[PDB]
Design a protein around this ligand. Sequence first.
Ligand SMILES: CCCCCCSC[C@H](NC(=O)CC[C@H]([NH3+])C(=O)O)C(=O)NCC(=O)O
Ligand SMILES: CCCCCCSC[C@H](NC(=O)CC[C@H]([NH3+])C(=O)O)C(=O)NCC(=O)O
Lengths: 219, 220
Amino acid sequence: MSNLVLYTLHLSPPCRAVELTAKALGLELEQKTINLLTGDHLKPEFVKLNPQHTIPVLDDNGTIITESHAIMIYLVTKYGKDDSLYPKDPVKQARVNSALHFESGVLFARMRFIFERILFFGKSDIPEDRVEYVQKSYELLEDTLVDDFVAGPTMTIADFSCISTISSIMGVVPLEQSKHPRIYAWIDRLKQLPYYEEANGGGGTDLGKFVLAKKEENA
Amino acid sequence: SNLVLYTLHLSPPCRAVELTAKALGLELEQKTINLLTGDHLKPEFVKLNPQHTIPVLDDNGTIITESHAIMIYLVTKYGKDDSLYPKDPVKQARVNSALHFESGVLFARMRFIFERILFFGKSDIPEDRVEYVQKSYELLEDTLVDDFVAGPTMTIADFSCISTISSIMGVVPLEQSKHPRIYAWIDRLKQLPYYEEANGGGGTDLGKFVLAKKEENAKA
Ligand SMILES: CCCCCCSC[C@H](NC(=O)CC[C@H]([NH3+])C(=O)O)C(=O)NCC(=O)O
Ligand SMILES: CCCCCCSC[C@H](NC(=O)CC[C@H]([NH3+])C(=O)O)C(=O)NCC(=O)O
């Protein structure tokens, strides 16, 4: 059939989670750039694909899938050769599902509460409370990492959500190494992947850099 | 033997679980975790959930944290059919997408509003917080193309959404004339014979309690 299509932007953290998932699955993704910065997500063809007007959005031969965590689950279920990235055991799957919602309701939400007002609303500060909210999220991630990976002894799509966000926010709200030895060790694991820098590492670094740059530019 | 829920009825994600349990005909044994007295910060609770949030499910020794994971787990283990959580990958992707919209958008913005009031002695709701919330309503309204959030059928994504929306509309006004789809979706849900007991009273009461805490904090 047709190559999977991702409506996407490499700077976007949930887009990078899907790109790591694809690489892990040995899937090739056709990327169509939706540039948020020149407003492409609000242009009206894109709004028909996604009424929430967010990226990523998946086009699988006419089946449209919105939302990074739904996209990654969809890809593993349909294109996985096993369920190592997304367990089929109800209990180990619950540990993954709980970690995905941690990423969306805590890690990504708090990051967005910090980045969006700068990238999109023209602000030039990061308030004391935002810093504390984010740093609290780092601490929750540290406490969750009782195992090598976020949702157990094995790497799952919940690791990809988590690192796509953490690698972006770390260079704005500092993640100090000694308060956070478990996160540090975990980053190291994921960096061992052959596709890590390419599918996430650098896009994360660059998003952090870009927010600081646009913030001096807003002050 | 008893499925146990570590819970507080005012908490939206606890009520989402309560709705799901009713929809499946399950009976939950509820154990109070009083967040207002820091029950969740105690070592006994942190052992159950290192993120120290409610709800936590205890299924005969098996510990399942996080409302959305718990609802899935429960439908997976106890559902007689798949209508509340589909097996079909595409249909299921539309529910999973609404669940992450509830956690990442509806709940996270409601908590960005409530938490500072209930725990940090704040008397205000900053302007931007109100704007985040109003924007969450508009996104939900645009999502409701069908009768329910993830299609023509009611799913666990409806329980998660209403538990929250029923709590925040008490505090940040959800204007009827601008959100007629949300109002019609609410009326569908309140038809459920277990709606009031499982959700309606708690949602209303959390709204009230936030409004009362806010006034209290503005005195002293
Ligand atoms: C260059 C910076 C990249 C932006 C950083 C935030 S990620 C992009 C943002 N995406 C989301 O909010 C997606 C959240 C959703 N939970 C998912 O995981 O897909 C968006 O499309 N926002 C557009 C909108 O919401 O209107
Ligand atoms: C008076 C009732 C008001 C409670 C409203 C917020 S709900 C309770 C709050 N729960 C959560 O954040 C859980 C959200 C999570 N994604 C889920 O759905 O399980 C909590 O335990 N918070 C504790 C913490 O983070 O320390």
